[PDB]
Design a protein around this ligand. Structure first.
Ligand SMILES: O=C1c2cc(Cc3cc(F)cc(F)c3)nn2CC[C@H](CO)N1Cc1ccc(C(F)(F)F)cc1
Ligand SMILES: O=C1c2cc(Cc3cc(F)cc(F)c3)nn2CC[C@H](CO)N1Cc1ccc(C(F)(F)F)cc1
Ligand SMILES: O=C1c2cc(Cc3cc(F)cc(F)c3)nn2CC[C@H](CO)N1Cc1ccc(C(F)(F)F)cc1
Ligand SMILES: O=C1c2cc(Cc3cc(F)cc(F)c3)nn2CC[C@H](CO)N1Cc1ccc(C(F)(F)F)cc1
Ligand SMILES: O=C1c2cc(Cc3cc(F)cc(F)c3)nn2CC[C@H](CO)N1Cc1ccc(C(F)(F)F)cc1
Ligand SMILES: O=C1c2cc(Cc3cc(F)cc(F)c3)nn2CC[C@H](CO)N1Cc1ccc(C(F)(F)F)cc1
Ligand SMILES: O=C1c2cc(Cc3cc(F)cc(F)c3)nn2CC[C@H](CO)N1Cc1ccc(C(F)(F)F)cc1
Lengths: 178, 179, 178, 179, 178, 178, 178
């Protein structure tokens, strides 16, 4: 399934990590967050000044898993370029929006969604789900430079944004074709 | 699902983290998780009983006896242990979190911490036995938070999470850092 | 899953067997018994006087599988230190109590149970399960130095013991913290 | 279920046991178990047809034709075969145990031995064929225990286990040891 | 699961193939036929006069898969010793009967059946299953040197033969003990 | 499962591919077609003049997957010897018939069927299954040198032919025993 | 001279033997070896898994007598803790070094010597003494895990070791004060 490339031989995913690329593809859960966090801490130890590239094609996932990734992103010193490929929905678009200012990108045909689905590691109470939702509000507000009221009304609409809308909204900075 | 290789020598990224003296406690805790964690704690202590060990916890909880096995191994070894709450630490997970070396218990800004126990069991047990275990949790939590038993029991009765700052004031951890 | 540690590279469990540590963790069946016995015979061949450390965190298992380990423990010449970590229930607590006198240990928060559950490789008769139950009576009587009547009454009470009660009952010798 | 490595040369512990000329018959006996066991028997004979082979049996039984394949290979090779009952030997397991070289059949003290056959089969077969197989077991059991057919048939009718000393007196094994 | 032996290291089955041994154990299907055919052609390329040993413990299987092995046996130049261990039923006993004259063997306690069970890769018509049954008749007649009528009567009886019965019938040549 | 042969070591299937043998065993689907096409292109890259041996034991499979092999067989320049071992039914019999003229073979007891079963990756319309069926008619007509009417009447019969029938029909050129 | 302690009354040395303590104090000759061996066989018969404690304060003695004790120590199944109190010189330090690995001890102010004095029941020839010395070199090599050359050079030096020197050399495992 997974091919080998190139003195030294790597599986193609290990070779992408040698380029300082971290993939966040597919639904986000604790093991994805564990793998993502492991690579971020590793790449920073190799160099805390060289940029990291986080390529995101994700429909969303566990909220606490996503915030762990978000928090690790804020922790390391490295500039992080985020790229939306295919889509970034729910927790995925939160990670996309959290890359280094000026370094958040999308491919031309991507779809971006900040609406949250209607998940949880264990079952939780209504006060807890609202507390988490407020955390998403503040993080999105921080990185889009929109106000809380703008973020809450926008997240109430069950819809995807085009890459240019997300650019205008503050989720990303540039839409590139090459 | 594929674990990447990093480099003279090549390691999988998780083996590379263990060489950094990092132990991951991610996901639910059961016996095989406890076995894997204990092996690493004893190994890391055998490399050096003076160097700190960093335990990164992202766990919803798990088997109480398995969590207690990790707790005892933590207390047994001589090493300072820095615990870090990443994502969440609930039930047995926040017990391990609170059991790190005083002054070295941390959280990232957006974590959630829960000491309420869920309503699991290796074998089916009697009511006196589950109460015996629940009292062991009370005393361990009181020991490391320096709270009183009555405060611990009232707190664990509330089905809820705390922020990193509440958990710091409660005595579960010492520092909430952002960088 | 299982990490590698290092001139020589080991999976961490193979490195523990290099310390002469044998884990008996999880339920005991023939497959567990085969692996434990394989390691005990191997560790004896490396040195038949050097102590072996058996780390037990088990809820119990097949009686004949547990007796196979018990007999292999009695057979080899090595002193065996037993450790109860987490718990030792049913056949697990029998192996715990069967370590070398003076070398049976528990960590402080362990739970120990000698009550048997209400399994079997093949279905057996009532006379056969009683024969097995009496063998368990004899082994516990032998190693705890309690009488048949005391063991029979104790295994009838469906409960766990603390490390200190198990010490005073004769199941182990010391409860250690460091 | 992780198999450890032991050490100039490295083996998984089961390959190390096979280098010691030990063959495990642990768990239920089916065709693939028989193929694996037969392969090691022929290999061990090819390494040396004079050196004993150690067959350690902890089995509840299995497919009769598969067990007979092992039985025949035991009879075919020239090596003395020391058999050990560990845990239990029931049905075909007790047939192989009883088929070791005379004077070299052993049990550990707390083992159980059963020659009763259960009430399995590769394909469905007719009543005459099952009766033909059961008679082969009678003749094989009579040969190695030196008991008579009538004694074997009565004993196999009782749904029960024997202790190692009972099986010693019956002729299933020669020595019951502890050290 | 599969042990390693011995300069050079082998899994025990690869070592058996180095001894020019091919195992036919368990039910016969297309993948078994592919594996057995691969080894037969390989062993021939190493030496087309050197004998090959085929060890059969099989309850039967797909007729066309069995015919594929049978034809490869007839095709290669090597003498083939067949050995019945445990049993040879249906297609398994056809492979046993198809070894080199004088080199077809059984161990003393084997069971041999030439009756076919009441299988198919795809569902087939009544005239086609009758064509397959006749091919089996002709092959058995060829190698046992019995007549069509006797083979048809024998395969109507749902029963097994002893090693000596199969010898006198022409399925094999010698019943060996050592 | 798959043995190793030996100096260099190969799994027995990799050793056959070194001999320029391609196995088409079992049902044909996209995964098989990808594997067969990869081997065909590789073998041509080693030599576009050296013959390739395609050994077929197949009950049929996905039509488009079979056509992908058919076209790749036609594309490469190498002589292709096809061998029917066990059986070739539906798309398998189409591949057998598509080998290089004069180099299509069968073992003596094989069964060949050109009737199609009553498949497709996704659900399709009646005009589409008829277009595929017409493609099968034309390919079969081309390589057997039979007329469309002979092919269509023949494929209407749910039946197998013997290797000699298949030879007389134009599916293969030679039926050999050694 | 020998006090009585207490119901049962014992002389204090019989009371130490009830604790499974065996004293090896003073010079070693055949009668000492006979007494020590008698006690070892007795303690094993009471429990062959319970440890035995051997307290050594001896300047040495007859080589064959010391070897007799050594052989009995190796023979019994019991773990043996050896303790050096005061001194262990020549065969005494041989017995000290021959305890169960991990259970060889000294009190803080003891002196240990492996140099042999310039020891025989009857007068013997040179080759014989050489053979005995070689047996001694091999026993020390076995239990200290040093090489023959290191042991022979070490035994040439007319000197005593401190408890920590003897620990680093492999003669003992732990130096205890409380
Ligand atoms: O970066 C850290 C670190 C993370 C955290 C807490 C934290 C955890 C988290 F899950 C997310 C967070 F945001 C922050 N604290 N530290 C301080 C000390 C450690 C180890 O010394 N390093 C350095 C390091 C790590 C891994 C590697 C390599 F190569 F093995 F991968 C090499 C070097
Ligand atoms: O530390 C111990 C030990 C602790 C305990 C009791 C205990 C058990 C437990 F399960 C949890 C506990 F908290 C405490 N018993 N031992 C005896 C075994 C050895 C040797 O003395 N070590 C040291 C050691 C271990 C492993 C490795 C390496 F590298 F192989 F991994 C290297 C050195
Ligand atoms: O120890 C034994 C032994 C066990 C038993 C019977 C028994 C079996 C059992 F399953 C449980 C039991 F309690 C007792 N009998 N023997 C006598 C001869 C054998 C082999 O010669 N060895 C020696 C040996 C050394 C090294 C290694 C290796 F491969 F692991 F390195 C393996 C084995
Ligand atoms: O012993 C035999 C043999 C026995 C039988 C009959 C038989 C079959 C059976 F299934 C069970 C039986 F009891 C008896 N047939 N052969 C022919 C194959 C060869 C050549 O003579 N050997 C010797 C040999 C084998 C294996 C290995 C190694 F190392 F590869 F494993 C090395 C040497
Ligand atoms: O033997 C044959 C062969 C079989 C058939 C047809 C056939 C196919 C079948 F499925 C069953 C059959 F009975 C007959 N035709 N040939 C002629 C040319 C080929 C390849 O050139 N070889 C040679 C060869 C094979 C394998 C190996 C090695 F080592 F890789 F295994 C090395 C050399
Ligand atoms: O042959 C091709 C080729 C054929 C087709 C069209 C086609 C595709 C198809 F799926 C089926 C068909 F019938 C035809 N396209 N290409 C792409 C171009 C490349 C080199 O540029 N090669 C050569 C080559 C192949 C494989 C290897 C190896 F083995 F190493 F991988 C090495 C060299
Ligand atoms: O231990 C042995 C023994 C030693 C030796 C040879 C040997 C002799 C030696 F001097 C040093 C050695 F290392 C080995 N062989 N045996 C086998 C059988 C005997 C008696 O049957 N016992 C058992 C026994 C002893 C003493 C008592 C008690 F208490 F009465 F004194 C009770 C039971």
């Amino acid at each position: 399934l997974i091919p080998i490339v190139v003195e030294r031989a790597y599986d193609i995913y290990s070779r992408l990590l040698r380029e300082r690329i971290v993939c966040v593809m597919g639904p986000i859960d604790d093991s994805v967050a564990s793998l993502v966090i492991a690579q971020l801490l590793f790449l920073q130890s190799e160099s805390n000044k060289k940029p990291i590239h986080m390529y995101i094609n994700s429909p969303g996932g566990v909220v606490t898993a996503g915030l762990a990734i978000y928090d690790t992103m804020q922790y390391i010193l490295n500039p992080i370029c985020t790229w939306c490929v295919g889509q970034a929905a729910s927790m995925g678009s939160l990670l996309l929006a959290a890359g280094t200012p000026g370094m958040r990108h999308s491919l031309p045909n991507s779809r971006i969604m900040i609406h949250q689905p209607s998940a949880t590691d264990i079952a939780i109470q209504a006060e807890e789900i609202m507390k988490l939702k407020k955390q998403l509000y503040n993080i999105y507000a921080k990185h889009t430079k929109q106000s809380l009221q703008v973020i809450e009304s926008a997240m109430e609409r069950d819809r995807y944004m085009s890459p240019m809308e997300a650019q205008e909204f503050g989720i990303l900075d540039k839409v590139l074709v090459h």
